[PDB]
Each structure stands twice: as structure tokens, then as C-alpha cells.
Symmetry: C2
Subunit: 171 residues, 2 copies
């Protein structure tokens, strides 16, 4: 069976978590929330409460068949880690060409991998300049697939995003 890591901090955009999570679990893929402390709760911008399954200190990227990075302000919080551990965890997926999914602000974390040069991505408008400066070919589409990397912009894109992330895991 296949397992998707979801990296999460407070103030994620609720639907960016719940919608892809439900699409993945509907297709038969288990999800596992990675955050600061196992068995702590993080809380979305609109109040959704999510239990963290695995602490980032313990997390083994090699356990997972994909990574999902929900947006909101969760990616900004994650990038506040004084040891950069979320960027490092993400770098496993980018460096080894494992399916990697990010929506909205989520592509911020990918910047921290330094693996974006020559890759094609999209993201929410707020974050597109930063993706470009990291060396991505940034476009403005509802969903963009570059080999293993799937990105979308906003919640309105979720149908497209959800179809592509499931297709990755099937492949």
C-alpha cells in the first residue's frame, strides 16, 4: 500500500488540507501528518483541527510514497524552523524524484530545496516572484505537472490538482 506525507503547521488553508487528503484516501492511499510534535494539534485559518502523526525530528522521508504541502500560512511557519528541517525533509522528495504536490503557498517550501532550477511550476500569485527567483519556469495555470512535481494556485483549482496528484500515485 502507498502512504503520503503531509507537512503542516498552524494556519494552513483548511480546504487545501481536507480536499486533497480526502481525494487521496478515497483512491486508497493513506496520509500521515508531519509537524513539530507528534500528537499535537494544529489549527487551520478557518478553525479546522488536525492531529500531527509524526514529529519532524523523527520523520523518515523514505517511508513515504509522496509529499503534500498544503498552503495558507502553514508554509511560512514551517520555514521558520531554525534548523530548516522541513526544507530538508522536502529535499528528499525533490532530489529523489518522488511525487511532490503543493498548492497555493505550498510551493514556498520547495524553494528551500534549491532543486527548482529549470522546473515548471505554478502557485498563488503572492508567491510567484519568489518561485521565479528560485529559478523555476513559473506559469499561471490551474494545475502544472513537471515530472514528479504537481502544483496548483488556489482552492478553485482543487478538482484539477486532485486528479493529477492521484494520477501520480497510480503511476
Amino acid at each position: 500500500t502507498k502512504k503520503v506525507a503531509i507537512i503542516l503547521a498552524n494556519e494552513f488553508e483548511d480546504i487545501n488540507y481536507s480536499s486533497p487528503k480526502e481525494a487521496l484516501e478515497n483512491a486508497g492511499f493513506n496520509t500521515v501528518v508531519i509537524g513539530d510534535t507528534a500528537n499535537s494539534e494544529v489549527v487551520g485559518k478557518h478553525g479546522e483541527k488536525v492531529t500531527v502523526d509524526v514529529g519532524i525530528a523523527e520523520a523518515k522521508p523514505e517511508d513515504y510514497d509522496a509529499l503534500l504541502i498544503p498552503g495558507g500560512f502553514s508554509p511560512d511557519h514551517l520555514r521558520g524552523d531554525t534548523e530548516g528541517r522541513y526544507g530538508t525533509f522536502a529535499k528528499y522528495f525533490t532530489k529523489n524524484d518522488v511525487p511532490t504536490f503543493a498548492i497555493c503557498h505550498g510551493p514556498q517550501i520547495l524553494i528551500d530545496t534549491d532543486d527548482l532550477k529549470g522546473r515548471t511550476l505554478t502557485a498563488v500569485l503572492n508567491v510567484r516572484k519568489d518561485l521565479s527567483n528560485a529559478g523555476a519556469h513559473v506559469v499561471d495555470e490551474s494545475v502544472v505537472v513537471d515530472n514528479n512535481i504537481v502544483t496548483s494556485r488556489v482552492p478553485d483549482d482543487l478538482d484539477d490538482f486532485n486528479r493529477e496528484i492521484v494520477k501520480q500515485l497510480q503511476l
Copy 2:
């Protein structure tokens, strides 16, 4: 004697209030520039601020300096469909006009495309983006690179406030 303060919802309250009071204590007027004149923006901790001037009508030449408070306000400002806050800020970087940013505030400066070779600091969370923009990024309580003054976190505010006031006083030959 007017300082522009570009502001959306979810600014870090003290990042707005503290530099504002330091500037007004030194004899400078502050003007809040936001999406809609007369509307209210609300800080992470509830502080309510009234917008004086709508970004559509704002003219950067009116102002002696630009202040960019942090929190998630700068991220909101970067969401403007026409990029009008970045464009507003470009006037200051292009013309070497005093420009002050704290915490996340320097994110907006990335949108000027004028950072290459400049020296700045910011909150840890945005340093990598400043680096990719071509800046020399340091970890100091306040950095002054000609016209650009940056600091990292609320603990830096005493240093930040000293430097922004000094910049302006020197502009006016005090």
C-alpha cells in the same frame, strides 16, 4: 514630512504602532496606504487602523519615506492583481528614497526587482527569498544600506526606530 505606510489585514500590530509613534514623536506625519481609502485594516492582535489613501490614488512622489510593517500584511499586499504595491515601492528603490521594513516587510521589496547587491536583514522565514532576489542577507538587529533600513523582529524595534528617525532627520537637515 509624510511617511507612507503600506498596510493590509494581519499586520503585526507593534510593527505598525511602534515605528509610527517614533516617527510622529520626531515630528513626522504618517499616512496609511491600503486597498480602499476610509476602510479599516485589522492586525494579528486586533489593532484597528484606518486607511487614509487608496493604492489606486496613491502617488509615491508625495512621500518622504516608505514604511512596511510585517506580519502577513506584506503577503496580502503581494496578492494585488496589478502588483500595485510592488510598483509603489519601486519608486523608493529606484530613486533612493528612505525605505524602512521590518520582519516580513522586506518581502515587498523583492517585488521591486531592485535588491541585487543590496544588504538587508529580515525575519528568518523570508531570508532565503531575499537571498534568491540577489541581496546580501545578514542576521543583525538593524541594517542600514544607504536608504534601506531593515530589522528582524519586535525585539529590534529600539534599534529600528532609532535608524529610521535618523534617516529622516538627516533628509530634513535636522
